[PDB]
């Protein structure tokens, strides 16, 4: 659709950038090294906080409106951030770091597997709906708001 009414593509470009970055970091991290371990968790925490802001912006500026006008599924992150905090606060040696690493990798993989199709659905399903329930200028205005909150 026209760029000026597209409320997902730019935010999702950033979220996908952040996904690729944590996938790269995770693959390069030495989980036996406490500094590498904690640097990874700190990066993940900042990333997932931005993911949380993203979903909240969608809720407050896009989905609430779209649901009112069109009139079921209720548009994870908090649990992930809690997992990271546990790593930063409760892991004190190599045994605990490597046991944590296994659980961390399983949860991030599951998360990533769910998050990419989540974004795709917004683009493929919600955006067409936005065209049907809102005027072109109403959508330009929503996009201005969504960008201002992301950037």
From Swiss-Prot:
Binding site for Fe(3+) 1: 12, 54, 58, 122
Phenotype when changing residue 12 to A: Abolishes iron-binding and promotes its degradation
Superkingdom as given in the UniProt entry: Eukaryota
Region annotated Hemerythrin-like, chain positions: 1-151
Phenotype upon changing residue 54 to A: Abolishes iron-binding and promotes its degradation
Entry PTM: Polybiquitinated upon iron and oxygen depletion, leading to its degradation by the proteasome. Ubiquitination is regulated by the hemerythrin-like region that acts as an oxygen and iron sensor. Undergoes constitutive ubiquitin-dependent degradation at the steady state by HERC2.
Annotated residues for binding of Fe(3+) 2: 55, 58, 75, 118, 122
Domain notes: The hemerythrin-like region acts as an oxygen and iron sensor by binding oxygen through a diiron metal-center. In absence of oxygen and iron, the protein is ubiquitinated and degraded.
Subunit-structure text: Part of a SCF (SKP1-cullin-F-box) protein ligase complex. Interacts with ACO1/IRP1, IREB2/IRP2; the interaction depends on the [2Fe-2S] cluster. Interacts with DCTN1/p150-glued.
Remaining remarks: Binds a diiron center, that can be bridged by a hydroxo group. The hydroxo bridge is not present when FBXL5 is in the reduced form and seems to play a critical role in regulating iron binding.
Name assigned to this protein: F-box/LRR-repeat protein 5
UniProt source species: Homo sapiens
Lineage: Eukaryota, Metazoa, Chordata, Craniata, Vertebrata
């Amino acid at each position: 659709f026209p760029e000026e009414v597209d409320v997902f593509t730019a935010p999702h470009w950033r979220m996908k950038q952040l996904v690729g970055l944590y996938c790269d970091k995770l693959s390069k991290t030495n989980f036996s090294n406490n500094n590498d371990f904690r640097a990874l968790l700190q990066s993940l925490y900042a990333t997932f906080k931005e993911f949380k802001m993203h979903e909240q912006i969608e809720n407050e500026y896009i989905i609430g409106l779209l649901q009112q006008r069109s009139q079921y599924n209720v548009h994870k992150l908090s649990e992930m951030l809690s997992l990271f905090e546990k790593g930063l606060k409760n892991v004190k040696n190599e045994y605990e770091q490597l046991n944590y690493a296994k659980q961390l990798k399983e949860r991030l993989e599951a998360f990533t597997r769910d998050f990419l199709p989540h974004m795709k659905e917004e683009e493929e399903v919600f955006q067409p709906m936005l065209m049907e329930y809102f005027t072109y200028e109403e959508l330009k205005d929503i996009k201005k708001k969504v960008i201002a909150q992301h950037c």
